[PDB]
């Protein structure tokens, strides 16, 4: 086996999948995106970005909601045409390639979103906008607790200095996960992330031979990842159920259903 | 159950 093939193929296939990457992410906050830190700004950019949803309306902080699932549906169809790219991925059972993607698409969602954010805020609509991360702990709760514990991760995670190419294999491993409730065939699957996460060790002892933990820190933000889904999940409910205004997307509601 | 991944996974 050619492992420095599988990683390469990993890697192409994040740079084919993601509509952002960090190499990307990080030509746009060097300095254009419209600043978001305050109630006009946010209206002003709307009225640019999604003018749509403005045209008509609901509550700042739903119509922020309704932004962050909008971005959610469509990183989770990445993710799905990314794991379709997944030497191994698509020989999986149809019915374990939806598990793996149901409690693997969140995990992978957030240790993402640590590439376009920075300890001020974060990139949003495809690159246009920047949110600061003042404005949105400004929010009415509930809504004002869903992104603080992100940026908390994003923070650490940024400070391991990875590159796309570590970031691929990163979520690539995250998928390919063979704890999952549910899955039909374990045996399969664990053998399937014995040899990814076996690339992702490889790849980082060469990329990184400064950081001899590497792996093991990585290893933990898996764990770390997983608690915060599972936090991030109990405040959807919250949401779901005490705020009518904030709809939530088929998609989005078939993933959490029966999660944890 | 998951009408929507397993469509994407088409
Ligand atoms: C012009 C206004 C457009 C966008 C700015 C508004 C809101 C922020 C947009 C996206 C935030 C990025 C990711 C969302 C992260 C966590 C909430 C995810 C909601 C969910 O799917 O459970």
Redesign the interface.
Known sequence: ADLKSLAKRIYEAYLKNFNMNKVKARVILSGPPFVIHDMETLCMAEKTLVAKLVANNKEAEVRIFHCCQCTSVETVTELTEFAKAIPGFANLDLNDQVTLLKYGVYEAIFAMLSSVMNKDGMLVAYGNGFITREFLKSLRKPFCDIMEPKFDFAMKFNALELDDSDISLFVAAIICCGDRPGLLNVGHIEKMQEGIVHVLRLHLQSNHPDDIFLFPKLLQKMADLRQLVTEHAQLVQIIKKTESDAALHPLLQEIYRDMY | ??????R??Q
């Open positions: 159950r998951h009408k929507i991944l397993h994407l996974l």
